[PDB]
Amino acid sequence: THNVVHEANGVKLRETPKEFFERQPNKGHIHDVNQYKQMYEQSIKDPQGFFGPLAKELLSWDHDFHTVKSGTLKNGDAAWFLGGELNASYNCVDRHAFANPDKPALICEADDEKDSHILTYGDLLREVSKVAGVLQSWGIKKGDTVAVYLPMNAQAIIAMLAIARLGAAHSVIFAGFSAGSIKDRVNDASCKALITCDEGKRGGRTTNIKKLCDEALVDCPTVEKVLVYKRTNNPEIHLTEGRDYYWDVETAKFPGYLPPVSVNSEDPLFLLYTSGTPKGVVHSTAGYLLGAALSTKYIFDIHPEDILFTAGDVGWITGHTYALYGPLLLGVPTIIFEGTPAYPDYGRFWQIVEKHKATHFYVAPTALRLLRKAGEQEIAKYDLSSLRTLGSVGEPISPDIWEWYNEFVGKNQCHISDTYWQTESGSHLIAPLAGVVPNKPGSASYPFFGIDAALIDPVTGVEIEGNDAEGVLAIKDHWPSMARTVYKNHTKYMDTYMNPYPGYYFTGDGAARDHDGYYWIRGRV
Amino acid sequence: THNVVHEANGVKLRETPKEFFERQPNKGHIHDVNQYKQMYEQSIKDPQGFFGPLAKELLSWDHDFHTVKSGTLKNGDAAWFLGGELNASYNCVDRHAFANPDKPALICEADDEKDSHILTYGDLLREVSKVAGVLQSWGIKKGDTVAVYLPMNAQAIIAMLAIARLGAAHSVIFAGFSAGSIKDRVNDASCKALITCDEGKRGGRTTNIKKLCDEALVDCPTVEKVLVYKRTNNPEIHLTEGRDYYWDVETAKFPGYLPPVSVNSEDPLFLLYTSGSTGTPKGVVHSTAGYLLGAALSTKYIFDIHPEDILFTAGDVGWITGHTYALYGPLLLGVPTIIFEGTPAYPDYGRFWQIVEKHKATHFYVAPTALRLLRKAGEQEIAKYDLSSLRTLGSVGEPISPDIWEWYNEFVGKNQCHISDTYWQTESGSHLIAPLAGVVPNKPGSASYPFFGIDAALIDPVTGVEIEGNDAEGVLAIKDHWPSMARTVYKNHTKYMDTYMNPYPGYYFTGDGAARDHDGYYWIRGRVDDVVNVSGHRLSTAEIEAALIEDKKVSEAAVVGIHDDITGQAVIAYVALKELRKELVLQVRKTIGPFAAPK
Amino acid sequence: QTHNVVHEANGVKLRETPKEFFERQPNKGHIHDVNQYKQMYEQSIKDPQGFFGPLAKELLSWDHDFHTVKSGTLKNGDAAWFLGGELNASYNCVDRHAFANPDKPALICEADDEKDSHILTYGDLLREVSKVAGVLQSWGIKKGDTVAVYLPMNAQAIIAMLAIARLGAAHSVIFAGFSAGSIKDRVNDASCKALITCDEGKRGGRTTNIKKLCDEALVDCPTVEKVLVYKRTNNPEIHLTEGRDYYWDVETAKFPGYLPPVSVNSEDPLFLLYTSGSTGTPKGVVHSTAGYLLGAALSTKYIFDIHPEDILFTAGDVGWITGHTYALYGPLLLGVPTIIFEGTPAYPDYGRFWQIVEKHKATHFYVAPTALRLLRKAGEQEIAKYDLSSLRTLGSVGEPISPDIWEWYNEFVGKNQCHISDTYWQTESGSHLIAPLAGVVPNKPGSASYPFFGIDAALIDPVTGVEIEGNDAEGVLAIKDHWPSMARTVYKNHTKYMDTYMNPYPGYYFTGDGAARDHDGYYWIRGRVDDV
Ligand SMILES: CC(=O)NS(=O)(=O)OC[C@H]1O[C@@H](n2cnc3c(N)ncnc32)[C@H](O)[C@@H]1O
Ligand SMILES: CC(=O)NS(=O)(=O)OC[C@H]1O[C@@H](n2cnc3c(N)ncnc32)[C@H](O)[C@@H]1O
Ligand SMILES: CC(=O)NS(=O)(=O)OC[C@H]1O[C@@H](n2cnc3c(N)ncnc32)[C@H](O)[C@@H]1O
Known part of the structure; x- marks a missing residue:
């Protein structure tokens, strides 16, 4: 009985349902919790012997790395896989296309299903190559930043991967953001180009995209050229002569293969700005990609046969890591949903899952609460038997929402993965592995590989040893x-994460840990 | 008895003469036609296992490739040797210089023999490095295009290899092209620099080179700097201050070694502009690794090139023949190549044979047009010279008539040499159909069997379906x-798809009609798409018509092609005036070039 | 044996290495005896490929392997070494040592005033170099650019050089005392895109004008896009031109403590070093990357007998080739600490050099004879106050060393317990040409002794232009x-390069120095050929 961790008292462990293992196509990546603890202990005690091999296994390198791990938190010089060279678009597209070009890669569900379509890895390579050829002709090169202002669809994925192909860093801006937000982000990054579309369609409503871009770009001198996709082909949308060019027109000029540009492990893969003044969180290439592939493989138990549906926007780190990189690195299909959970009806998510036999579903608790209110009747209409792993992202999931998730969507036949992580972490920090870790509803459970979690007393600034503790998570x-x-x-980076608690990474979240080692997220501090 | 292939009826196979194998420096690369077909089948069914090894054998890689072959015709995303890195100038120059820097590389015969000279691989490395150092100081870098407007001499080769050394793509413009032609090509490629010379010498007459470049460059804003070679060192030729600089003066500033720049297999090696059925010339882009492998492979096997051999390709670098078989093929294989600046007639019609005797050339590559001209005027001169060093004779650019084939064999080859009628296009990069020297017996006038990696087929033009069985005629794909x-x-790239990939989906469209006989030999009957090959030059009737219409006095114009005794085919122009023939001949001479003028 | 030509050699007894040298050396010597030395020398001359290939792979960390050890000839000025290889100098000087042991000292910085002294570890140096390189990379500096340095001898000069190298650019170091016209001429010749300097310098207790001379030059240097200024004195009266000049601390705060290095080809230029030139125009000596770095590490290792445990103190300025090779590259490639002295030998007193040596137990000391003569005049009394037992190798650079100065050096500084290395070399040679190896070659005072690996020395008669065979000879050294x-x-x-070194005596490299060789093969440098 915990006097501090009141959540832990009288909550029974929920073993993984049998139907999960029934539906699993192959042997599990981890046999039992003990094997997990052995691997975890190695990842903490021996990061070299643990991550080096996995990095070589899960990623295709243009040049081998000579040092797995370097740098310290206090000095803000962390680096992984030093000396290595690789290209993200190759690991997400090229190698899979060569293996089997006809395998589905992007299952695109548009706002209206009539406009839905599917791209194979061969298709994705050709589109990425053409956009990258357009960008290369425009002078985009390694070390540049390219802005993306697109909805959740194929063009957002292609824009990101083409920018990566040339070695540039993409900065994805949520399509709903105001012109002033676009202005601040583009000017901070000094982007040389912008990829967007004339208009968007969401929930049946047309949305202004190119208009807001024009209103921003009048104050963004660094943007030399804009690439505009005709999502709606509305003739009234205006293109500025000498700056704005059409996606189809330019991609028609260039061939379906373009050599990728090798980049160093620690060369920046992308900037992602977080909502005060916006700050661009920078993620390297090798470390981020490994984290995405590693978490996607183990936390969700993704196998080559599987199909993932991450209901997140690329404007959010969730979209980046688990809608694009994680899945495509592992070569599995990923579902890209442009619409809203309600349009045309609140059965939209389930309609898509049944349509594509999705094996994994990843959603935020906010949508779960909305669907709890309005779409309970619609859940029963659709066939969700293909699913076996359900994920929760972005906020604490209350046990009642946990049980609702398990009953109506999972049918108490699926594993539930409550993933805790930040934009800054790149991938999962604390999460219960699918098919390995029994669940405590509302608990993120054990930390993942390479994550040495700790609780600090804020007043003393001292780590709290032992279980049955509460404090700021670091x-x-x-x-x-x-x-x-x-x-x-970089001073802001240090002041925000490294300096507040020297020797530690400060999450900005408070959390508690019980006698079983499960971590309970108490929310922001 | 062929009911369709009338050419094949009553044609006896011509085995390679015994004297060929006597003169051959070593055992042949392929034993017999049977081994050739076994290797060919492997190249078709299993291209990875066939070309992968050859690529490692014949090319020196900065980074190893992970995929031999990728992409399809239907999608226009063909790629070979993916992930590999290499440099063309290293494979053509550096490695051979390290082996033996004193080995001859460029045997340069100038328009007048007094100006002839020879460069060793060490010499070529130093000159290439110096020009590349000039270009690198000017800001030329990987991904740029550099224009070349030079005659056929050492400086053209050096300019091309220097551009390649830096990872840029060279665009060679035939020295005869008009100022307007230079303008269109430079502006299409947006070249940052141009390499040319003050004046040229051809057939004993001085020609204006820097003059035409200046006239073009007034409308080419992308050209930041020009490198001018003192071919004649005429002081009256004017250099634009701040743009034009002298070859000798600038190269003197930089050292004889410059590191080569690594490039990906599919990074573009060069642009070559070809007149098409559009009215505007189109820049054909060739990759690096794939093109180089094709050049070395075809040069080695179809011509049976050995290290001891010397090749003489009587073609201009402005033509794909010069690129592949005057420059890259030979230098990749490390053999000397003869670079002839003059004409077959100057000073006398024994000029070619004089050169062959002078350097004991083992291989000779020429277009049928020159053979017909020399047959007309220079037949007597062959006997004065010693041509015994030759064993392989090549034909390029046009169908070779059996009569010209026999003339080639009898008077030049002395019925002791192999004849290789090579069929290919600028777009193919290297030979498509050709009889391998010492391997394939010849049917005069037939290119014979397709080469490695080339799965030739005849498409029924009307139905668009591949024709099975032999003794057939159709459009070649x-x-x-x-x-x-x-x-x-x-x-x-849309023009690329519409021109080659889309007309017959799943196939590559040559634009040529051809036939296949019972023995499998292919007979090229010429273009189907109204393109005319005059004296070895591909010309578009559309471009000539547009040039004719440019003249305000002409209201309508229509151009066609017909058989010509000397140039193979001639172009005939018909004009309608609203209310002068020499003026129109000069108008097209000014629009395209002296070569494209109508007969 | 009386030498008819080599009058210097008569009556000079070989001076064997003192016993205390081998006592103090931490490990077995790199070379056993002179006989082994001559075997290796002959191999380096006859078989440079089989000799230098292995040494190059041992001492340097390559991003891409080389396919040819040696290419080109002197007569054609197309020399190239380790062709096809790729590497980065800042990685070999900083990164690899930092990964091995980030807390090992790298730069032992002794400032003009000792209170301002500090020590940077290889980890510290990695972070500082990475941050400066991040500043430069954001400014657009990239491979193929040149960056000028106008700094005194302190950490910032080393860091600036290594950061420029990290990005693949070539650094051109300018002596801090040079006039504005000198800065102008050098910057414009190189067309430098950026300049790294400081507000003011402090030398011998007095403040010196640095930023002022730079500004006076930069009004005539249109290529310089941006300037990085370090607050050496933080004098508020110092003016920065807005839109061009930015502060070292302010900018480096923006960027992270690690930056990937940029790989460059062996023969891509590592640095330009301009030589003080008689007549009008200064000439920029260009040094490759792989060849120069190997020469630095090789000479530093063998001539001075540097071991990982050792500490080197090179009393030379980075504006001089001595600072480049043996204050920065040689020691840092070998991963040993190097002492960087900002001040003068006299301030606060003439015991400053010896104070530093005792403070950090420096094992190797490298100085020019000029300082030795000055200290002989004024600072003999201070030597006795300090403990120099840590020393075992004493170096002489830049001038002929008089036998009297040689004996003074050995007795008062070395205590007749150290080896003395009279190193002969030029800016153009990159590293030592003729020098007696510590613990291997017995010394004749005033003689540079035997040539070093890869150096096939010869004497040419100026009149005949023919090589002089046999010993007891005099001529121009080539x-x-x-x-x-x-x-x-x-x-x-390059035509000036050919006319200066290659063309006057084709097939030879012309040093511009006259020298003699005695019966034992020891070389005696007699000085420049003009003025003979
Ligand atoms: C992935 C993401 O959302 N990145 S984020 O940059 O948007 O940060 C979101 C913040 O929300 C909190 N948070 C996120 N996920 C969970 C979770 N599964 N359980 C409990 N709290 C959670 C925490 O405070 C995070 O830092
Ligand atoms: C290499 C070259 O000349 N490229 S090219 O781009 O100029 O095209 C020339 C065109 O001439 C025709 N052609 C070329 N070679 C032969 C040959 N051996 N036999 C019969 N016809 C031939 C065909 O029509 C070609 O396409
Ligand atoms: C390192 C350095 O000095 N670079 S430098 O370019 O400044 O050298 C210029 C000249 O210095 C002379 N010189 C150098 N060292 C000695 C020495 N130990 N004994 C006699 N003369 C020497 C030599 O004549 C050089 O050519």
Whole structure:
């Protein structure tokens, strides 16, 4: 009985349902919790012997790395896989296309299903190559930043991967953001180009995209050229002569293969700005990609035969890591949903899952609460038997929402993964592994590989030893996918994460841990 | 008895003469036609296991490749040796210089023999490095295009290899092209620099080079700097201050070694502009690794090139023949190549044979047009010279008539040499159909069997369906892409698809009609798409018509092609005036070039 | 044996290495005896490929392997070494040592005033270099650019050089005392895109004008886009031109403590070093990357007998080739600490050098004879106050060392317990040409002794232009074939390079120095050929 961790009292462990293992296509990646603890202990005690092999296994390198791990938190010089060279678009597209070009890669569900379509890895390579050829002709090169202002669809994925192909860093801006937000982000990154579309369609409603871009770009001198996709082909949308060019017109000029550009492990893969003044969280290439592939493989128990549906927007780190990189690195299909959970009806999510026999579903608790209110009747209409792993992202999931998730969507036949992580962490920090870790509803459970979790007493600034404790959550050493800096403001990076608790990474979240070692997220501090 | 292939009836196979194998420096690369077909079948069914090893054997890689072959014709995304890195100038120059820097590389015969000279691989390395150092100081870098407007001499080769050394793509413009032609090509490629010379010498007459470049460059804003070689050192030739600089003066500033720049297999090696059925010339883009492998492979096997051999390709670098078989093929194989600046007639019609005797050339590559001209005027001169060093004779650019084939064999070859009628296009990069020297017996006038990686096929033009069985005629196509296939048309990939890939989906469209006989030999009957080959030059009737219409006095114009005794085919122009023939001949001479003028 | 020509040699007894040298050396010597030395020397001359290939792979960390050890000839000025290889100098000087042991001292910085002294570890140096390189990379500096340095001898000069190298650019270091016109001429020749400097310098207790001379030059240097200024004195009266000048601390705060290095080809230029020139125009000596670095590490290891445990103190300025090779590259490639002295030998007193040596137990000391003569005049009394037992190798650079100065050096500084290395070399040679190896070659005072690996020395008669065979000879000193660290060109003027070194005596490298060789083969440098 915990006097501090009141959540832990009288909550029974929920073993993984049998139907999960029935539906699992192959042997599990981890046999039992003990094997997990052995691997975890190695990842903490021996990051070299643990991550080196996995990095070589899960990633295709243009040049081998000579040092797995370097740098410390206090000095803000963390680096992983030093000396290595690779290209993200190759690991997400090229190698899979060569293996089997006809395998589905992007299952695109549009706002209206009539406009839905599917791209194979061969298709994705050709589109990415063409956009990258357009960008290369425009002078985009390694070390540049390219802005993306697109909804959740194929063009957002293709834009990101083409920018990566050339070695540039993409900065994805949520399509709903105001013109002033676009202005601040583009000017901070000094983007040389922008990829967007004339208009968007969401929930049946047309949305202004190119209009807001124009209103922003009048104050963004760095943007030399804009690439506009005709999502709606509305003739009234205006293109500025000498700056705005059409996606289809330009991609028609260039061939379906373009050599990728090799980049160093620690060369920046992308900037992601977080909502005060916006700050650009910078993520390297090698460390971030490994974190995405590693978490996607083990936390969700993804197998080659599987199909993932991450109901998140690329404007959010969730979309980046688990809608694009994690899945495509592992070569599995990923579902890209442009619409709203309600349009045309609140059965939209389930309609898509049944349509594509999705094996994994990843959603935020906010949508779960909305669907609890309005779409309970619609859940029963659709066939969700293909699913076996259900994920929760972005906020604490209350046990009642946990039980609702388990009953109506999972049918108490699926594993539930409550994933705790930040934009800065790149990938999962604390999460219960699918098919390995029994669940405590509302608990993120054990930390993942490379994550040495700790609880600090805020007043003393001292780590709290032992279980049955509550405090601010910190990490004792840097992990592969940890953000390396804040764009052109490394002092802010240090002051925000490294300096507040020296020797630690400060999450900004308070949490508690019970006698079983499960971590309970108490929310922001 | 062929009911369709009338050419094949009553044609006896011509085995390679015994004297060929006597003169051959070593055992042949292929034993017999049977081994050739076994290797060919492997190249078709299993291109990875066939070309992968050859690529490692014949090319020196900075980074190893992970995939031999990728992409399809239907999608226009063909790629070979993916992930590999290499440099063309290293494979053509550096490695051979290290082996033996004193080995001859460029045997340069100038328009007048007094100006002739020879460069060793060490010499070529130093000159290439110096020019590349000049270009690198000017800001030329990987991904740029550099224009070349030079005659056929050492400086053209050096300019091309220097551009390649830096990872840039060279665009060679035939020295005869008009100022307007230079303008269009430079502006299409947006070249940052141009390499040319003050004046040229051809057939004993001085020609204006820097003059035409200046006239073009007034409308070429992308050209930041020009490198001018003192071919004649005429002081009256004017250099634009701040743009024009002298070859000798600038190269003197930089050292004789410059590190080569690594490039990906599919990074573009060069642009070559070809007149098409459009009215505007199109820049054919060729990759690096695939093109180089095709050049070395075809040069080695079809011509039976050995290290001891010397090749004489009587073609201009402005033509794909010069690129592949005057420069890259030979230098990749490390053999000397003869670079002839003059004409077959100057000073006398024994000029070619004089050169062959002078350097004991083992291989000779020429277009049938020159053979017909020398047959007309220079037949007597062959006997004065010693041509015994030759064993392989090549034909390029046009169908070779059996009568010219026999003339070639009898008077030049002395019925002691192999004859290789090579069929290929600028777009193919290297040979498509040709009889391998010492391997394939010849049917005069037939290119014979297709080469490695080339899965030739005849399509019924009317139905668009592949024709099974022999003794058939149809439009010639290729069923899968090959290493040296052109990858795009510069910044216009849609024209590339519409021209080659889309007309017969799943196939490569040659634009040629051809036949296949019972023995499998292919007979090229010429273009189907109204393109005319005059004296070895591909010309578009559309471009000539547009040039005719430019003249305000002409209201309508229509141009066609017909048989010509000397140039193979001639172009005849018909004009309608609203209310002068020499003026129109000069108008097209000014619009395209002296070569494209109508007969 | 009376030498008819080599009058210096008569009556000079070989001076064997003192016993205390071997007592103090932490490990077995790199070379057993002179006989082994001559075997290796002969191999380096006859078989440079089989000799330098292995050493190059041992001492340097390569991003891409090389396919040819040696290429080109002197007569054609196309020398190239380790062709096809790729590497980064800042990685070999900083990164690899930092990963091995980040807390090992790298830069032992002794400032003009000792209170301002500090020590940077290899980990510290990695972070500082990475941050400066991040500043420069954000400014657009990239491979193929040149960056000028106008700094005194302190950490910031080393860091600036290594950061420029990290990005693949070539650094051109300018002596801090040089006039504005000198800065102008050098910057414009190189067309430098950026400049790194400080507000003011402090030398011998007095403040010195640095930023002022830079500004006066930069009004005529249109290529310089941006300036990085370090607050050495933080004098508020110092003016920065807005839109060009930015502060070292302010900018480096923006960027992270690790930056990936940029790989460059062996023969890509590592640095330009301009030489003080008689007549009008200064000439920029260009040094490759692989060849120069190997020469630095090789000479530093063998001539001075540097071991990982050792500490080196090179009393030379980075504006001089001595600072480049043996204050920065040589020691840092070998991963040993190097002492960086900002002040003068006299301030606060003439015991400053010896104070530093005792403070950090420096094992190797490298100085020019000029300082030795000055200290002989004024600072003999201070030597006795300090403990120099840590020393075992004493070096002389830049001038002929008089036998009297040699004995003074050995007795008062070395206590007749150290080896003395009279190193002969030029900016163009990159590293030592003729020098007696510590603990291997017995010394004749005033003689540079035997040539070093890869140096095939020869004497030419100026009148006949013919090599002089046999010993007891005098002539102009030349080298018969190019060596790894030989200068490759003079920036954008290769004809001047040829006319100066290659063309006067074709097939030879012309040192511009006259020298003699005695019966034992020891070389005696007699000085420049003009003025003989
Ligand atoms: C992935 C993401 O959302 N990145 S984020 O940059 O948007 O940060 C979101 C913040 O919300 C909190 N949070 C996120 N996920 C959970 C979770 N599964 N359980 C409990 N709290 C959670 C925490 O405070 C995070 O830092
Ligand atoms: C290499 C070259 O000349 N490229 S090219 O781009 O100029 O095209 C020339 C065109 O001439 C025709 N052609 C070329 N070679 C032969 C040959 N051996 N036999 C019969 N016809 C031939 C065909 O029509 C070609 O396409
Ligand atoms: C390192 C350095 O000095 N670079 S430098 O370019 O400044 O050298 C210029 C000249 O210095 C002379 N010189 C150098 N060292 C000695 C020495 N130990 N004994 C006699 N003369 C020496 C030599 O004549 C050089 O050519």
